[PDB]
Each structure stands twice: as C-alpha cells, then as structure tokens.
Design an enzyme around this catalytic site. Sequence first.
Site, PDB file in Angstrom:
ATOM      1  N   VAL A 121      85.919  59.327  31.977  1.00 20.96           N
ATOM      2  CA  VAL A 121      86.316  58.901  33.348  1.00 20.96           C
ATOM      3  C   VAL A 121      86.284  57.379  33.632  1.00 20.96           C
ATOM      4  CG1 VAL A 121      85.771  61.094  34.527  1.00 20.96           C
ATOM      5  CG2 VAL A 121      83.982  59.358  34.261  1.00 20.96           C
ATOM      6  N   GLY A 122      85.651  56.594  32.755  1.00 26.75           N
ATOM      7  CA  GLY A 122      85.525  55.150  32.915  1.00 26.75           C
ATOM      8  C   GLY A 122      84.891  54.526  31.677  1.00 26.75           C
TER       9      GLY A 122
ATOM     10  N   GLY B 114      83.993  50.744  30.510  1.00 26.37           N
ATOM     11  CA  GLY B 114      83.878  49.352  30.991  1.00 26.37           C
ATOM     12  C   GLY B 114      82.649  48.672  30.416  1.00 26.37           C
TER      13      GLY B 114
ATOM     14  N   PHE C 295      79.450  48.512  31.552  1.00 24.82           N
ATOM     15  CA  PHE C 295      78.413  49.587  31.542  1.00 24.82           C
ATOM     16  C   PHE C 295      78.329  50.434  30.247  1.00 24.82           C
ATOM     17  CE2 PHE C 295      82.125  50.639  34.196  1.00 24.82           C
ATOM     18  CZ  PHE C 295      82.674  51.700  33.488  1.00 24.82           C
TER      19      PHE C 295
ATOM     20  N   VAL D   6      80.424  53.757  28.228  1.00 22.63           N
ATOM     21  CA  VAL D   6      81.381  54.839  28.516  1.00 22.63           C
ATOM     22  C   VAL D   6      80.757  55.922  29.379  1.00 22.63           C
ATOM     23  CG1 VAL D   6      82.773  56.751  27.479  1.00 22.63           C
ATOM     24  CG2 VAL D   6      82.834  54.405  26.551  1.00 22.63           C
TER      25      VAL D   6
ATOM     26  N   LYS E 132      76.535  59.065  30.685  1.00 20.60           N
ATOM     27  CA  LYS E 132      76.778  57.764  30.160  1.00 20.60           C
ATOM     28  C   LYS E 132      75.839  57.577  29.012  1.00 20.60           C
ATOM     29  CE  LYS E 132      75.354  53.073  31.376  1.00 20.60           C
ATOM     30  NZ  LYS E 132      74.135  52.618  32.090  1.00 20.60           N
TER      31      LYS E 132
ATOM     32  N   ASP F 128      73.661  43.788  41.983  1.00 18.05           N
ATOM     33  CA  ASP F 128      75.071  43.915  41.592  1.00 18.05           C
ATOM     34  C   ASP F 128      75.918  44.806  42.506  1.00 18.05           C
ATOM     35  OD1 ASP F 128      76.923  43.012  39.885  1.00 18.05           O
ATOM     36  OD2 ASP F 128      76.860  44.874  38.570  1.00 18.05           O
TER      37      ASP F 128
HETATM   38  C1  LIG Z   1      84.269  54.522  38.225  1.00 15.84           C
HETATM   39  C2  LIG Z   1      84.211  55.167  36.876  1.00 15.84           C
HETATM   40  C3  LIG Z   1      83.245  54.469  35.980  1.00 15.84           C
HETATM   41  O1  LIG Z   1      83.688  56.528  36.971  1.00 15.84           O
HETATM   42  C4  LIG Z   1      84.433  57.569  37.486  1.00 15.84           C
HETATM   43  C5  LIG Z   1      85.818  57.634  37.665  1.00 15.84           C
HETATM   44  C6  LIG Z   1      86.393  58.791  38.211  1.00 15.84           C
HETATM   45  C7  LIG Z   1      87.879  58.901  38.405  1.00 15.84           C
HETATM   46  O2  LIG Z   1      88.463  57.921  38.806  1.00 15.84           O
HETATM   47  N1  LIG Z   1      88.535  60.060  38.089  1.00 15.84           N
HETATM   48  C8  LIG Z   1      89.688  59.903  37.175  1.00 15.84           C
HETATM   49  C9  LIG Z   1      90.238  61.270  36.693  1.00 15.84           C
HETATM   50  N2  LIG Z   1      90.564  62.135  37.827  1.00 15.84           N
HETATM   51  C10 LIG Z   1      91.143  63.438  37.364  1.00 15.84           C
HETATM   52  C11 LIG Z   1      89.358  62.349  38.625  1.00 15.84           C
HETATM   53  C12 LIG Z   1      88.825  61.017  39.173  1.00 15.84           C
HETATM   54  C13 LIG Z   1      85.572  59.863  38.584  1.00 15.84           C
HETATM   55  C14 LIG Z   1      84.196  59.810  38.410  1.00 15.84           C
HETATM   56  C15 LIG Z   1      83.597  58.678  37.867  1.00 15.84           C
HETATM   57  N3  LIG Z   1      82.194  58.561  37.650  1.00 15.84           N
HETATM   58  C16 LIG Z   1      81.109  59.328  38.072  1.00 15.84           C
HETATM   59  O3  LIG Z   1      81.183  60.451  38.638  1.00 15.84           O
HETATM   60  C17 LIG Z   1      79.798  58.651  37.857  1.00 15.84           C
HETATM   61  C18 LIG Z   1      78.620  59.131  38.317  1.00 15.84           C
HETATM   62  S1  LIG Z   1      77.350  58.027  37.950  1.00 15.84           S
HETATM   63  C19 LIG Z   1      78.498  56.976  37.201  1.00 15.84           C
HETATM   64  C20 LIG Z   1      78.049  55.712  36.611  1.00 15.84           C
HETATM   65  C21 LIG Z   1      78.982  54.747  36.242  1.00 15.84           C
HETATM   66  C22 LIG Z   1      78.569  53.544  35.691  1.00 15.84           C
HETATM   67  C23 LIG Z   1      77.221  53.298  35.495  1.00 15.84           C
HETATM   68  C24 LIG Z   1      76.270  54.243  35.877  1.00 15.84           C
HETATM   69  C25 LIG Z   1      74.819  53.922  35.659  1.00 15.84           C
HETATM   70  O4  LIG Z   1      74.449  53.332  34.643  1.00 15.84           O
HETATM   71  N4  LIG Z   1      73.968  54.318  36.639  1.00 15.84           N
HETATM   72  C26 LIG Z   1      72.548  54.294  36.648  1.00 15.84           C
HETATM   73  C27 LIG Z   1      71.785  53.419  35.870  1.00 15.84           C
HETATM   74  C28 LIG Z   1      70.402  53.457  35.944  1.00 15.84           C
HETATM   75  C29 LIG Z   1      69.769  54.350  36.797  1.00 15.84           C
HETATM   76  C30 LIG Z   1      70.522  55.211  37.578  1.00 15.84           C
HETATM   77  C31 LIG Z   1      71.907  55.185  37.512  1.00 15.84           C
HETATM   78  C32 LIG Z   1      76.691  55.447  36.446  1.00 15.84           C
HETATM   79  N5  LIG Z   1      79.730  57.419  37.211  1.00 15.84           N
END
Ligand SMILES: CC(C)Oc1cc(C(=O)N2CCN(C)CC2)ccc1NC(=O)c1csc(-c2cccc(C(=O)Nc3ccccc3)c2)n1
Length: 289
Positions: free
Chosen positions: A17-18, A20, A22, A24, A38, A131
């Site tokens: 889904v992303g 970058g 961070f 994958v 991730k 950030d």
């Molecule tokens: C923004 C991108 C990175 O992520 C997403 C893009 C889409 C999307 O655009 N789709 C495309 C396909 N479509 C069919 C549906 C929509 C959906 C969900 C997520 N991510 C998530 O649901 C998510 C949940 S947490 C997270 C995330 C991203 C980057 C870093 C971290 C992280 O490291 N967090 C962290 C670190 C330490 C302690 C606690 C949290 C978490 N991402």
Amino acid sequence: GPLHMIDYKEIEVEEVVGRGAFGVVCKAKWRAKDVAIKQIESESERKAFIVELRQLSRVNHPNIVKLYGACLNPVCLVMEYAEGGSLYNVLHGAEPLPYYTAAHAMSWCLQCSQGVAYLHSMQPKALIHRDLKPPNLLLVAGGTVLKICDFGSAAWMAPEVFEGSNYSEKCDVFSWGIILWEVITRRKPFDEIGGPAFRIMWAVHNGTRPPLIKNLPKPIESLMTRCWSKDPSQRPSMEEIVKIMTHLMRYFPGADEPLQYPCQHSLPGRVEPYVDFAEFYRLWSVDHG
Ligand SMILES: CC(C)Oc1cc(C(=O)N2CCN(C)CC2)ccc1NC(=O)c1csc(-c2cccc(C(=O)Nc3ccccc3)c2)n1
C-alpha cells in the site's frame, strides 16, 4: 494492555500500500482483522521502538492508529489498517481527487490536534511527534476519521528544529498550523519555492510563511498565524487548539459526510481557499449579529 508478540504464520499478506522512506507497508489479515504491516528495515528503528515499548504500549486514542504488536521473524510492526490512505493523498494525489468541504478541513485538523494533545499529555514523558504532516495522517470511515501514524518534511518543520536549537512540543503546533493552511487552500506548502529542502529551511528560518488566505474568518486566521510564530512560546498549546477547534465545529456541520463527490481542481499576494466559508459566516451571523 501491553503489545502482543505475534506469530508471522498468523498473517496473510495482501498488496503493498505504500513504499517510501519509512520502508514498505502492506495490507494484511490477522485473526481476520484487516491490518497494515511494516517491516522494520534497520538495526536503527528496531532499537528505538525497543527503548520506547512502555510508552507505545500506553498509547490509545481514537485519532492514533492502534499498534497491535509485532512479529519477531521477520521483525515487523502490526497496525490498524486505514482503508482511506493518507491525507496527503486525498489532498494532492492522482486525479480523480475527491471533493471536500470546509467542514472536513476543520474536522481533520481538529482530530489531528486531539491525537497530538494526547501524546503531549502522556505521563511522565510527553511524546512529541516531530514529524507531523499530511503523509502521516490517515483516513478511515469514508474520509471522515483521521488517525495519526508514525508516533521532505521541511515545509511542515518549525524553524527551531532544523536550526538545531533544542525544542519542545511546540514544534508540533507549528506543523499543525501549516496543515490547517494546507487543508483550507488544498495547496502544497511552499511549492513555489521547491528547489531542494534547504531553500525552504532557509526561507522559513527567515520568517517566510504561507500566504494569507482571502476571506478566511479572522478567528481561524488568528489561530493559524499564532501557530506559525517564530517564538515557540507564543504558539498555543494543543490543549487550547483542541478547545478552540472543538467550539468552532458548531459553525462547520456535516464533517461526518463521507467523501464521494468528484472534483476537477486547479490553482490560480494572497490565495483563495479551496473550501467555502459562506455557510460559516451565515451560521456565525445567526448566533451573534
Ligand atoms: C500512506 C501509505 C503509506 O499507506 C497506505 C495507503 C493506502 C492507500 O492509499 N490505498 C491504496 C490501494 N487502495 C485499493 C486502497 C487505499 C491505504 C492504507 C495505507 N496504510 C495503512 O493503513 C497504515 C496503517 S499504519 C501505516 C504506517 C505507515 C508508515 C509508517 C508507519 C509507522 O512506522 N508507524 C508507527 C511507528 C512506530 C510506532 C507506532 C506506529 C505506519 N500505514
């Protein structure tokens, strides 16, 4: 309660889904909850997650992504999935982009400030985000609910942080200020400047700020400009931002309306808002005169 140790065998990995900075991130199912996972890439983030386990354990708020736990092989975080993706993407992604309202803009910003207020109120060490920006703000419930995760950033960073002067939670208030401007104008902050990052840093460090917005209601302008202050101590606290924002929501009904209408959108001293403040001036009139 504390964070779980999770068998990787229990996780069916669907699409990426992303990808970058961070690392994958992927969709997944786990105990048939939808999740995002991730991989922790480095020995670096592996380590700081681990010094902070007692704090990450303790975070629990509606506008912060739930951290369910981690696998140990491979080492990865397991997190609440946000079907809506990033605010950055809603605002500036690929056509077709969704229509949204002043009410949505203010709501998102209110929700951001609630989550951040909570992290600032953590006892005994206040968590500071450092950030805060739309790529880390994720949306669910049809775009209506915003959730911070991760509890070129230069355009949202407060001058004291890149300046290397030791900083406080006020740096997050600066970021939130910029975010407010961003959702209201649907413009990327300092896009005109671009070049490399240091051009922005330099500009902002010199007192440059996003342009004022035509016809922005004065209270929102005051709050926004007060968040942008050079002097961190002249910025409001988040607790205060929350209460102002919460009270303004009376003049911005309809934020529970899911995103769904299409939009074909393009950009012209000063800038027009993307959102429309007429209903606000109306409801505001009724109350006052
Ligand atoms: C923004 C991108 C990175 O992520 C997403 C893009 C889409 C999307 O655009 N789709 C495309 C396909 N479509 C069919 C549906 C929509 C959906 C969900 C997520 N991510 C998530 O649901 C998510 C949940 S947490 C997270 C995330 C991203 C980057 C870093 C971290 C992280 O490291 N967090 C962290 C670190 C330490 C302690 C606690 C949290 C978490 N991402």
